[PDB]
């Protein structure tokens, strides 16, 4: 399941299990496995020949893939990514609504549009204009006639 | 403010209405002037209530209604019409088509117009949060109780 | 066209003062891309300037 969390294909997990077949639990080291193994071995169709290295890795890989994707569904873990965030809406929701109902320029009265033009024209065309007259003015005033 | 509540056209219309009440043109509304227009509309009130409906809007207490007080009355009337319906317009901004549900494409349309951009996948993240029913659309009832999409 | 229609309709979703600010922003010749005015209309303002 950890390998599936690391985005591995079905072949990668199988070869990972092939090299890690010795990490399966030991019945002596765990009290829980004592009764589970006894209950597991009591089934009618359980043959010890079915515990082949290939048969073990196939069933573990199939179940692990199902188990991994199952908990991705029940626990989407998509929280803490986009939580309830109120970016600016709770105070700026009136602005975004006002944006979609903003009056276009061609619907304004002519006199109102002209006043807006004068403010825009002076800031972008008159203020931005460069006229250097200080040097010329001082030179003219410094001459005796 | 009056500029926020009223437009230039509305101010002109209110001035004409004020001049309709003020036949004299002195700039003030008296009880007889107010009473005269009420009789033209059918009502026949007494001076007791006629004074009361003047004092209810008369600010300086001079006993007469001038245009600044008349505009202030109309400004309140325009403002208090909407109390909590501001969420209705907010819902319609997300609801382009005009039905009672917010679709993911409609949520894309408003998000496209806004500054922030979505990668066509996280749009499903917040719509499923807002949509409790799981039908893929956020209705008006789901929007007011909790707003995320 | 496609989603970038928002860029073209950005003018109509802006206050009228901002709309006319964008229209007149063609003086420095480095802003002839955001301004959507035709060249003939641009010439009249430059002639008056
Ligand atoms: Ca009068
Ligand atoms: Ca008064
Ligand atoms: Ca809709
Ligand atoms: Ca729903």
Swiss-Prot record, chain B:
Mutagenesis or variant effect for residue 91 to L: In LQT14; significantly decreased of KCNN2 calcium-activated potassium channel activity; not changed KCNN2 expression; not changed KCNN2 location at membrane; decreased thermal stability in presence of calcium ions; decreased interaction with RYR2
Domain EF-hand: 9-44, 45-80, 82-117, 118-149
Chain positions found as N6-methyllysine: 117
Sequence positions that bind Ca(2+) 4: 131, 133, 135, 137, 142
Modified residues (N-acetylalanine): 3
Phosphoserine sites (modified residues): 83, 103
Protein's name according to its UniProt entry: Calmodulin-1
Protein source organism: Homo sapiens
Gene: CALM1
Swiss-Prot record, chain C:
Subcellular location per the Swiss-Prot or TrEMBL entry: Sarcoplasmic reticulum membrane
Taxonomic superkingdom: Eukaryota
UniProt tissue specificity: Detected in skeletal muscle (at protein level). Fast- or slow-twitch skeletal muscle.
Modification after translation: The N-terminus is blocked.
Subunit structure: Homotetramer. Can also form heterotetramers with RYR2. Identified in a complex composed of RYR1, PDE4D, PKA, FKBP1A and protein phosphatase 1 (PP1). Repeated very high-level exercise decreases interaction with PDE4D and protein phosphatase 1 (PP1). Interacts with CALM; CALM with bound calcium inhibits the RYR1 channel activity. Interacts with S100A1. Interacts with FKBP1A; this stabilizes the closed conformation of the channel. Interacts with CACNA1S; interaction with CACNA1S is important for activation of the RYR1 channel. Interacts with CACNB1.
Cited function: Cytosolic calcium-activated calcium channel that mediates the release of Ca(2+) from the sarcoplasmic reticulum into the cytosol and thereby plays a key role in triggering muscle contraction following depolarization of T-tubules. Repeated very high-level exercise increases the open probability of the channel and leads to Ca(2+) leaking into the cytoplasm. Can also mediate the release of Ca(2+) from intracellular stores in neurons, and may thereby promote prolonged Ca(2+) signaling in the brain. Required for normal embryonic development of muscle fibers and skeletal muscle.
Domain notes: The calcium release channel activity resides in the C-terminal region while the remaining part of the protein constitutes the 'foot' structure spanning the junctional gap between the sarcoplasmic reticulum (SR) and the T-tubule. Pore opening is mediated via the cytoplasmic calcium-binding domains that mediate a small rotation of the channel-forming transmembrane regions that then leads to channel opening.
Other facts: Binding of [3H]ryanodine indicates that the heterozygous channel is activated by Ca(2+) concentrations 4-fold lower than normal. Single-cell analysis of cotransfected cells shows a significantly increased resting cytoplasmic Ca(2+) level and a significantly reduced luminal Ca(2+) level.
Family: Belongs to the ryanodine receptor (TC 1.A.3.1) family. RYR1 subfamily.
Protein name: Ryanodine receptor 1
Protein's organism: Oryctolagus cuniculus
Protein encoded by which gene: RYR1
Stretch of the intact protein here: 1987 to 2035 of 5037
């Amino acid at each position: 399941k950890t390998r599936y969390a690391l985005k591995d294909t079905d072949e990668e997990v199988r070869e990972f299990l092939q090299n890690n077949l010795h990490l399966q639990g030991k019945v002596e080291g765990s009290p829980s496995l004592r009764w589970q193994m006894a209950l597991y071995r009591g089934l009618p169709g359980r043959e010890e020949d079915a515990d082949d290295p290939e048969k073990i890795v196939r069933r573990v890989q199939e179940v692990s893939a199902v188990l991994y994707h199952l908990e991705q569904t029940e626990h989407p873990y998509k929280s803490k990514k986009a939580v309830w965030h109120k970016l600016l809406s709770k105070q700026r929701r009136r602005a975004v609504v006002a944006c979609f109902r903003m009056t276009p320029l061609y619907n304004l009265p002519t006199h109102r549009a002209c006043n807006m033009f004068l403010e825009s024209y002076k800031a972008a065309w008159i203020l931005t204009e460069d006229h250097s007259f200080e040097d010329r003015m001082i030179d003219d005033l410094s001459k005796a006639g | 403010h009056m500029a926020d509540q009223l437009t230039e056209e509305q101010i002109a219309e209110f001035k004409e209405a004020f001049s309709l009440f003020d036949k004299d043109g002195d700039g003030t509304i008296t009880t007889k002037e107010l009473g005269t227009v009420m009789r033209s509309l059918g009502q026949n009130p007494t001076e007791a209530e006629l004074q009361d409906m003047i004092n209810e809007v008369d600010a300086d207490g001079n006993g007469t209604i001038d245009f600044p007080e008349f505009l202030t009355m109309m400004a309140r009337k325009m403002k208090d019409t909407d109390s909590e319906e501001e969420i209705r317009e907010a819902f319609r901004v997300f609801d382009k088509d005009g039905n009672g549900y917010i679709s993911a494409a409609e949520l894309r349309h408003v998000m496209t117009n806004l500054g922030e951009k979505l990668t066509d996948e996280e749009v499903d993240e917040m719509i499923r949060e807002a949509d409790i029913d799981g039908d893929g659309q956020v209705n008006y009832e789901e929007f007011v109780q909790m707003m995320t999409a | 066209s496609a989603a970038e229609t928002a860029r073209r309709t950005r003018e109509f979703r802006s206050p009228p003062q901002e709309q006319i600010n964008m229209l007149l922003h063609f003086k420095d010749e480095a802003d002839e891309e955001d301004c959507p005015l035709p060249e003939d209309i641009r010439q009249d303002l430059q002639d008056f300037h």
